[PDB]
Amino acid sequence: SGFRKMAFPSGKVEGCMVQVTCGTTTLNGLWLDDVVYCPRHVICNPNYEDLLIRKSNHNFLVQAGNVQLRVIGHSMQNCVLKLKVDTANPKTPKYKFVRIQPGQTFSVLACYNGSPSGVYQCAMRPNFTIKGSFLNGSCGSVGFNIDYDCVSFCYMHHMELPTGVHAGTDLAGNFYGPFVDRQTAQAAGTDTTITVNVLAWLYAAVINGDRWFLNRFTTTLNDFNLVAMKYNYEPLTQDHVDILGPLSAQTGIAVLDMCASLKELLQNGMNGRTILGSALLEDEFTPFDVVRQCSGVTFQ
Amino acid sequence: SGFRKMAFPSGKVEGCMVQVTCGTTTLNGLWLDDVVYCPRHVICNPNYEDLLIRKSNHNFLVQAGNVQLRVIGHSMQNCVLKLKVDTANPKTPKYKFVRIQPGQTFSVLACYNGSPSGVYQCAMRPNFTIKGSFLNGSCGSVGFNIDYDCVSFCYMHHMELPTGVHAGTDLAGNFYGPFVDRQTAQAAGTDTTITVNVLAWLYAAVINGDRWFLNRFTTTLNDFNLVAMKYNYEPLTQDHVDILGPLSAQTGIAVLDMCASLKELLQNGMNGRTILGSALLEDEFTPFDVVRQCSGVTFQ
Numbered sequence: 001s002g003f004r005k006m007a008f009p010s011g012k013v014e015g016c017m018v019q020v021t022c023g024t025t026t027l028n029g030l031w032l033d034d035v036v037y038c039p040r041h042v043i044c045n046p047n048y049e050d051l052l053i054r055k056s057n058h059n060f061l062v063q064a065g066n067v068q069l070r071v072i073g074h075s076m077q078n079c080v081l082k083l084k085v086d087t088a089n090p091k092t093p094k095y096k097f098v099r100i101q102p103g104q105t106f107s108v109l110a111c112y113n114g115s116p117s118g119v120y121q122c123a124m125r126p127n128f129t130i131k132g133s134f135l136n137g138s139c140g141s142v143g144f145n146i147d148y149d150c151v152s153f154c155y156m157h158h159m160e161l162p163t164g165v166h167a168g169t170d171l172a173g174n175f176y177g178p179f180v181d182r183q184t185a186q187a188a189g190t191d192t193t194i195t196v197n198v199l200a201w202l203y204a205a206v207i208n209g210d211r212w213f214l215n216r217f218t219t220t221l222n223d224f225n226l227v228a229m230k231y232n233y234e235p236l237t238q239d240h241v242d243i244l245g246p247l248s249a250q251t252g253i254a255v256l257d258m259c260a261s262l263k264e265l266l267q268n269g270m271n272g273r274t275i276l277g278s279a280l281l282e283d284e285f286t287p288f289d290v291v292r293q294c295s296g297v298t299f300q
Numbered sequence: 301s302g303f304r305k306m307a308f309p310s311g312k313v314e315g316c317m318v319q320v321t322c323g324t325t326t327l328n329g330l331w332l333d334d335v336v337y338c339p340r341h342v343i344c345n346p347n348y349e350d351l352l353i354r355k356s357n358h359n360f361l362v363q364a365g366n367v368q369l370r371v372i373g374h375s376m377q378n379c380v381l382k383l384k385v386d387t388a389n390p391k392t393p394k395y396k397f398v399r400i401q402p403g404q405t406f407s408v409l410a411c412y413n414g415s416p417s418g419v420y421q422c423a424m425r426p427n428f429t430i431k432g433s434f435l436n437g438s439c440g441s442v443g444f445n446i447d448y449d450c451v452s453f454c455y456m457h458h459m460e461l462p463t464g465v466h467a468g469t470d471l472a473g474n475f476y477g478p479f480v481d482r483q484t485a486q487a488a489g490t491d492t493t494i495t496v497n498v499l500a501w502l503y504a505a506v507i508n509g510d511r512w513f514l515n516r517f518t519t520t521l522n523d524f525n526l527v528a529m530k531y532n533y534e535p536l537t538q539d540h541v542d543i544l545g546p547l548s549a550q551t552g553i554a555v556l557d558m559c560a561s562l563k564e565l566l567q568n569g570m571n572g573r574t575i576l577g578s579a580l581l582e583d584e585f586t587p588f589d590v591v592r593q594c595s596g597v598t599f600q
């Protein structure tokens with residue numbers, strides 16, 4: 001038992017990290033087969049189309065550790081640059097590029113000068129920022145999930161907002177949210193709490209022995225979403241309810257009954273008490289996360 | 301900027317995880333050079349001496365993926381079993397075995413059937429338990445730090461205490477704490493909050509732009525330790541003060557001044573406020589963890 005903010009083992013992704021240097025800029029790239037993916041502002045209101053037409057392959061220095069990777073071609077796809085190199089990465093895992101929905105979680109492998117510094121778990125916030133941990137040089141670090149043997153890359157890091165939160169793209173270079181990779185006024189936008197994730201984490205607490213916050217009540221989905229509005233929370237759909245089905249069957253707690261508990265927690269607070277070691281209602285665990293950690297899924 | 305509970309990249313350790321099956325017990329081992337390290341209870345008031353002498357090499361089934369390693373010798377060291385295999389692990393990293401002090405943190409690679417399930421950060425609590433996330437089959441998962449190129453293994457997992465927390469050994473088989481690998485009554489014993497770590501985390505908050513908890517007051521090391529006792533905090537030593545020196549110099553906040561801030565947080569609570577996204581005072585970041593993550597150290 002126990003419950004931790006658990007990242008996926010980072011091994012398959014560490015094997016893909018490289019360093020991309022162009023001009024006075026150095027950042028990270030993701031090397032899959034014979035392509036290196038990296039944020040396009042490595043060539044830096046910019047006009048990346050002109051900026052890139054004026055590049056040559058030899059302007060791009062790519063180290064894979066202590067082995068210079070030679071660029072033989074390049075193209076831009078949205079906000080990422082794809083550098084064709086003359087060597088296929090022999091450590092390339094089985095992989096998939098996926099664009100995730102807000103509320104979904106992923107692991108981030110934070111990197112500098114092409115070498116991993118740390119791994120941690122994040123969520124795509126409803127306002128399409130992530131509350132990451134990134135310093136100068138971290139751009140190009142990626143976010144990912146693992147499904148059995150396959151790495152699903154869902155994020156690459158581009159920039160930090162004035163509020164200290166982070167914005168980036170899918171691996172096809174499309175920003176999550178309204179953000180752009182130019183230095184102009186941009187702000188996150190009002191965030192909300194991910195309701196279905198809070199519910200899942202309350203099921204995790206029950207699976208792990210915490211029951212103090214349960215009650216005999218129930219609510220309707222409509223009356224529950226009515227209190228969720230006030231507390232800044234996302235609407236819970238019948239689809240969310242179906243998704244919480246397995247967790248509700250494992251625990252014997254009807255999904256609407258757990259909603260009644262979350263209502264009482266928003267209305268009354270925790271009164272100096274904790275849940276799974278937190279004094280706040282946690283929303284960066286998805287229903288699938290809870291089942292994975294509480295049932296012991298592995299990856300190969 | 302930002303601050304997350306960050307684990308070390310797990311790749312180097314993933315390359316060392318194997319499955320060890322003996323009789324009807326299955327768990328993980330750590331394969332380094334031609335030695336597989338695993339908890340000795342895989343051969344189960346037992347008497348592991350008699351129990352081991354009645355074993356043969358062919359009783360131990362060591363799965364390294366879809367490759368069965370062959371045991372050619374076994375030896376017990378304290379509570380760990382060392383299986384000599386006829387194949388050196390080609391993925392063996394540069395490594396050390398270290399036995400850490402309480403208050404030190406480390407990354408845990410949770411595994412089942414030789415296959416890593418997830419990575420998370422832990423502290424050795426002052427009562428020599430860890431608050432981990434472990435299910436049946438997780439024994440033999442390891443904890444570790446990485447220093448430039450070197451993996452320092454500091455923990456191997458053995459058992460769960462009735463309170464939901466975890467006990468294990470160093471890699472030389474010595475338990476942390478008074479615990480033993482015997483099904484007999486054992487309990488964590490009273491824990492305390494790691495004071496030097498809370499202070500480091502407050503410095504982390506300051507580096508990241510939180511200052512709301514600061515004050516103009518100061519305190520003597522004596523008078524600070526006096527309130528810490530009342531709140532079940534560890535005594536802060538002059539050595540702890542020295543250790544917090546670099547964080548104090550970078551932030552301009554004298555160590556005893558940040559102590560006066562912790563005192564007021566202890567006496568007044570946060571009154572609905574948060575620090576680094578937490579409504580509790582966090583003590584699982586060491587002063588080195590803070591400097592590492594706030595200055596961007598990497599590993600190769």
Ligand SMILES: *[C@H](O)[C@H](C[C@@H]1CCNC1=O)NC(=O)[C@H](CC(C)(C)C)NC(=O)[C@@H](NC(=O)NC(C)(C)C)C(C)(C)C
Pocket residue numbers: 027041044134135136137138139140158159160161162166180181182183184185186187301
């Ligand atoms: C790439 O390594 C770097 C990563 C950030 C550096 C500090 N923390 C980070 O996450 N990104 C980067 O340099 C950005 C480059 C562009 C995408 C803007 C071209 N620059 C920034 O993130 C900057 N923020 C910023 O200017 N924000 C607004 C005004 C909203 C565009 C800085 C964090 C100030 C460098």
Ligand SMILES: *[C@H](O)[C@H](C[C@@H]1CCNC1=O)NC(=O)[C@H](CC(C)(C)C)NC(=O)[C@@H](NC(=O)NC(C)(C)C)C(C)(C)C
Pocket residue numbers: 001327341344434435436437438439440458459460461462466480481482483484485486487
């Ligand atoms: C090995 O995979 C396993 C890991 C635990 C299983 C669930 N969570 C865990 O961390 N350990 C294990 O099977 C232990 C075997 C001995 C070390 C006791 C020989 N058994 C336990 O951890 C058990 N706990 C227990 O009996 N604790 C006291 C009473 C303090 C000895 C169980 C968790 C009940 C299996």
